[PDB]
Design a protein around this ligand. Structure first.
Ligand code: R75
Ligand code: R75
Lengths: 115, 115, 115, 115
């Protein structure tokens, strides 16, 4: 709801299905603590990672496990994963879509922030 | 010198070699007239398309023959070609690099304008 | 329904709203004939361009009017527009999403093809 | 020589100049140890990060300080930084270029691996 992840495959022209996504939040002791995780659906989307109540101000890292995605397709990719690090909700609650477009040696990521 | 084209391959993580590139300039009657062409080098670059004397202000189209590139690699592509259409202006910087990053179902293009 | 266009703004992190989109289909006389047009919604999406009945096999060009989008925002962009040229429905009907991500000197486009 | 970083600006259509770049190598205990760093040149490039002798197989992280880059331009950014994580392998080609294309709410990264 407040945080959604969408992943596309630039080789097949398709949603990237069953991609593992791990979200971390930076803690007071400046360490990365686990916040939420899931896998993308048949539409390439991952909903329900968190709630408005739990998604407080902070620095978040969305790690998209691109290497295991490509390896499951029989491809040896370049990157270990795609990491998206950003401050969230510093100006009040927002809704964030973190999108990634994947190729074996390249990826792009963008944020769509609304409300 | 005033206009360079660089093409990269996001699947192989390499320069895109031997890619045909056609440049057109818009004529008075809204027709695309051929201006310059070539094939990318082993570095993925196409130099020597034009000269300062010939590269006047105008609307230019750079067509990158991506479909034939992917077919030569045995890879099934989406686009017929990649087309980059832009106005060249003399008050902005006067070296133009048109770069493209290719995947089978996606491409990105950027302009690097210097000096 | 069979053809959707989605446009995002990489500067604001938002849908690109009210972007003009023109679709052409290559005719027998190898000319570009108008096929459909519209403008993106508040979600950055353009639905209803065509129907299954009208969206026959062919070579299509989706022209996204990026220059007028940026100029309306007070920015002088590099490109005249973004052009996406592809063969559609050659293996039977498909559903096509043509997506574009816009910056003043760069754009990316990808195709999501389903069914 | 074996590792180069290049950073481009998609808003201005220019090299991204004076961008801080930090490279880390994964240690035995899963900690990121500092490996090399620098700032991009006027061409947007960072050369001389390492030598062939020092750049052994391993997992590397390239952190590009995009937030400070956008702040210096008076532009409001989304990401804290851009992070590129990859394994270097000796049997693949042995020159690595890590390239990044930056917008305020989006970035793309690709690897160009040659020789
Ligand atoms: C080796 C990578 C690279 O080499 C260059 C040489 C001259 C000018 C630009 C570049 C360049 C980048 O443009 C680049 C990075 C990404 Br990510 C792209 O999606 C596109 Br398109 C271009
Ligand atoms: C909200 C982001 C989003 O919305 C979609 C709706 C339908 C199909 C694809 C997408 C999509 C993408 O992941 C996307 C991501 C990047 Br990065 C791009 O450069 C481009 Br272009 C598209």
């Amino acid at each position: 709801c407040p945080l959604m992840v969408k992943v596309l495959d630039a080789v097949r022209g398709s949603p990237a299905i069953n991609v593992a996504v791990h979200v971390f939040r930076k803690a007071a002791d400046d360490t990365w603590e686990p916040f939420a995780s899931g896998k993308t659906s048949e539409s390439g989307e991952l909903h329900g990672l968190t709630t408005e109540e739990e998604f407080v101000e902070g620095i978040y890292k969305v790690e998209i496990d691109t290497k295991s995605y490509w390896k499951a397709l029989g491809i040896s990719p370049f990157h270990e994963h795609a990491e998206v690090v950003f401050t969230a909700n510093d100006s009040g609650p927002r809704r964030y879509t973190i999108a990634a477009l994947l190729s074996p040696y390249s990826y792009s990521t963008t944020a769509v922030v609304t409300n």
